[PDB]
Design a protein around this ligand. Sequence first.
Ligand SMILES: N[C@@H](CC(=O)O)C(=O)O
Ligand SMILES: N[C@@H](CC(=O)O)C(=O)O
Ligand SMILES: N[C@@H](CC(=O)O)C(=O)O
Ligand SMILES: N[C@@H](CC(=O)O)C(=O)O
Ligand SMILES: N[C@@H](CC(=O)O)C(=O)O
Ligand SMILES: [Zn+2]
Ligand SMILES: [Zn+2]
Lengths: 146, 146, 310, 310, 310
Amino acid sequence: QVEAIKRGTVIDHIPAQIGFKLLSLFKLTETDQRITIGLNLPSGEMGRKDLIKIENTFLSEDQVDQLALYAPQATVNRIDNYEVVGKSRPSLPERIDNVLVCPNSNCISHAEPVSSSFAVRKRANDIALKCKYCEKEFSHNVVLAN
Amino acid sequence: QVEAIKRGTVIDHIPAQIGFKLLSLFKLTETDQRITIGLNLPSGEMGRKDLIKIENTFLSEDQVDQLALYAPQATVNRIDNYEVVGKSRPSLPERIDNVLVCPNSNCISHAEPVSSSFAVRKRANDIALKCKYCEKEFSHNVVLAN
Amino acid sequence: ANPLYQKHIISINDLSRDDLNLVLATAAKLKANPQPELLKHKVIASCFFEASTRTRLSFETSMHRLGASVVGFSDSANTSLGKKGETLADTISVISTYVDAIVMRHPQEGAARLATEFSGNVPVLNAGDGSNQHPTQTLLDLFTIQETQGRLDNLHVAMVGDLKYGRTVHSLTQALAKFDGNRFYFIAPDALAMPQYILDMLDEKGIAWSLHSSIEEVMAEVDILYMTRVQKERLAPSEYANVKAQFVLRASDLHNAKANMKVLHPLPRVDEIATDVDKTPHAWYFQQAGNGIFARQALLALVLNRDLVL
Amino acid sequence: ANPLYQKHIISINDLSRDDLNLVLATAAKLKANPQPELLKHKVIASCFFEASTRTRLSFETSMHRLGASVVGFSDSANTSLGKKGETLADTISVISTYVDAIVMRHPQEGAARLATEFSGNVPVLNAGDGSNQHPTQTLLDLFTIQETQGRLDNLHVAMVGDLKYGRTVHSLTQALAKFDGNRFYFIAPDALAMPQYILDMLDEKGIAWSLHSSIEEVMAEVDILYMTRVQKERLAPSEYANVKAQFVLRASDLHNAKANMKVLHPLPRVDEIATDVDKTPHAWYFQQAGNGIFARQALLALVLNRDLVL
Amino acid sequence: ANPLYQKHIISINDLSRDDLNLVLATAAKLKANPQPELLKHKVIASCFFEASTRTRLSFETSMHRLGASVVGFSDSANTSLGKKGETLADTISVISTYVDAIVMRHPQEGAARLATEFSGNVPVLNAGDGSNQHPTQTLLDLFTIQETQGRLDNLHVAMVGDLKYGRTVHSLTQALAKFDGNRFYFIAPDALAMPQYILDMLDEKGIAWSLHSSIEEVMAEVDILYMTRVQKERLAPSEYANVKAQFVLRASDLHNAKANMKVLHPLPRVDEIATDVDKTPHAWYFQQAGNGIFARQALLALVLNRDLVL
Ligand SMILES: N[C@@H](CC(=O)O)C(=O)O
Ligand SMILES: N[C@@H](CC(=O)O)C(=O)O
Ligand SMILES: N[C@@H](CC(=O)O)C(=O)O
Ligand SMILES: N[C@@H](CC(=O)O)C(=O)O
Ligand SMILES: N[C@@H](CC(=O)O)C(=O)O
Ligand SMILES: [Zn+2]
Ligand SMILES: [Zn+2]
């Protein structure tokens, strides 16, 4: 459609400046597989957006998990033999694995050898994450914040 | 490679695995300018490679040289009206500023409000980085990130 | 066979109304009818990485009154993790090959939770993790309440002092909320106000609570006045303005209270409770602590006994 | 305006065979003909952020011997940088607002260069910056090597001790390298060896140098045996095995010594030079230290006074 | 005998609009026409019982710039008061027996006044006494405010930071209050607010002043934005929440600034003034610091020399 390629998967509707954070925060550039990227691409729906094109690769739950509280409006879709075979939404599980870090500095998750983990109580306002260890809850605007 | 840019810069023939580096290093993506990047791409001259096109953005000759110790082999096409209006090539620079960190822990550069700086020179089959401040010399391989 | 058999006791948050009065029922049974060898050949690890008198001493006494043996330490300065840099994980990993159960109090929140991921079939009991949870404290608290008031329903409860760092009131408020009609009164400095996640939970079950500036404005309505110490070992420098109590309870200003009113405090207390409150019929922090013995005795049996008839 | 007028003297690597010769030339003039008022109406800052006996006292004596007045500190604990968190950049910006020149010693490498970037028109004289450079030390060494050898050429020189951290050898090796036909012997433990950037620099001029493990191997050939103290303050904990001096010059090791040969040491010495060596005629470190007086009046005169001297 | 000859300069509150004008008047004379021997044969004590970079080095440079010689200490740990238990009164009694004047900085409020009661005929110049006064600092600020505004009247001035402990604002507010029609803006946390005795003093003259919570509110109106560092050394543990700077001036906040407006800071600064502000044309704290040189030669000249200057 918008200039596809045999197999692989396209991540469309990425919010501006979030695109590049994905390539890194997800070792996406870790391959010999032809990748195409578009930053600050114009869009008739979000104003401006990012877009990644990973040739001969896929997701499902491996990472479309994080994409949730990241690109709440992104659109991941598989492409086979030049054709979109499945548009997807943000499957945003209530559980998030180790790629994350608890803000409570006195949480034992920092000192000891254990993969982080949060429960995601998605209030319609902002997103809240409760730590599996210290049990304190926060806002994803703090956990994902610098 | 997707499509042609009207005015700006296209860094051609970036080796593979480096294009992402360059993106991370010089914060080339911290802009509102349309950027199209393609990693792993069949070439002919060389095997395959990475490319980075960035709209309404030009590079001084030193800015281009900064690429020397990453993509020694590379072309930088200054583009105006969809046409190459000048092409350049990375020649080793005199110094590399504020992007690298001095490996010497007792260097004054780490504690004070000053930009880093190293003089460049090729020794054996390598380039040595001498810190303007502590005067200690290191193989570019060790001098890192930040 | 009982519901608490072989279970970890980490957070009140993982317990049901039943579990609680199950341990209170056992406690009542045990205080009246003592069972000297309920766990004759058991070895329990008492591990304290923080400081404590009540929780650690009541716990070990409990193990002995039940015929069990105890190992452990009161500080980690001499463990391998204190001198050889060993992880907590590994410490828990090896201790779990020596004991039937591990009781631990640790300075970081979540340490108990982390422990259960390395103790295998060994049940872990949280004597308090940082400022998060203190389950066995509320178990004895609920027992004390049940005792003095004869009910755990629609009571007028007030919690005073440092509510932010009080693992004691964190766990106690979650438990009291598993019961019906209880009204809560929160009297604390704004800097140590009592966490949101607690209040939100109270809203989920839509139950009454409200902040107050003084004790006297709720004195005549409360059945339980739970006093607290300022956790001056857990607070940030940007909060040292709160080291001193703020609300100090004396005998005199206890005149308009209900006759059945009982003054509780997990202890230790510094200045928040004048010693002149001690000779009054309301004072109940010592009797309270004494109940730690029956409550923890009750827990140890339910966790280490498939069944128990008494 | 002489070649050194209003110049920053921070690293020998920035100096030319001519610059050095001009300094020594001047020293001899001033030594021969003291100019008591050469720097009247001058106020120089003596800023030592690290310890010093020789270079700080000689520098100050020099300033008075030329009529300049001095301000500064020998300990940074009572400056604003020491108690109020001020950066060194700001420290230099304000100081450069009071004095005509800044002599400074600092524990971090590059500090003196950092200062030049904030001292505006006020020249900075590097009195030692970490384990990097020590230019005024080299000036006096040369003046001394010259005063007892008759020249700075085709000399055989041994440098033993801590060559990795000796800001003294780093500068002096570079200084002599700017002359012709000098041989170098590096007697030092593997861990504290002369650094690569000095060897590479030597290679570029095809200067002869080689590593030895005893003073004896070269004792007969050497003209200058330049001893150094191990820089315990600079050592990483892992080079601690080299804290104790590995080579100790005793008066008995001077038996087969070129009669012209002299023993030098930038000082202080711990035990690398037995006190019995002090009486031998090859003893010249104290004389060496006294020369610091002349090398420093010289450097001062050239940086704050445009005319060459009579 | 000028009005300031042999006077104690310890608190702006003891000075008159005339006294201040005489000092600045003199500064300009000396700045314009340096008098290198004005204080020949004078020995002044520089006694700093607390840290200092700017005021101690400038004061000493001044004394040399006028031909006076100096004695003293920058650390009280090696005086008899520091190791033998001597009182400060005795310390002053003996010192007043050697010098012609005593410049002193002390960590306790009132120290400089205490000295005047034991220094007999030797005048005492207060270089800072606890969080009270800092007279010579105000002198240079005024000289600076005057040098860049053209006057000391009807100026809009903002003082932000630690106003409670800033001995700097305490003196300067009092100094400007002695002039006419100056507006004041106090941007500071509730805990470190300008003290009452300064406000009351302002009320007495019907001077306009008001509290603000951002630089922006007044950025357009202000002529002088006088930034201060939080006095961590003075803080009671309970004001520790204010250790970190609450207001940070960035170069981007200077967009809507009266072109005449200048940014001042008695220094040192931690982060309240981003380094990007140093390049902007509103940057004047370093110039400000350099003026200290003139304000201090001035004050010195007036206290130890009876005639006005040419
Ligand atoms: N009982 C508290 C400490 C105290 O209140 O003194 C705890 O152990 O969490
Ligand atoms: N002279 C050396 C110290 C020493 O002699 O070890 C220096 O000041 O750098
Ligand atoms: N040795 C010199 C000081 C130095 O080595 O820097 C002197 O005595 O002046
Ligand atoms: N200038 C203040 C110190 C500071 O700048 O914080 C004083 O010496 O009183
Ligand atoms: N800033 C003044 C010192 C002070 O503030 O007291 C100076 O540089 O002279
Ligand atoms: Zn956590
Ligand atoms: Zn360096």
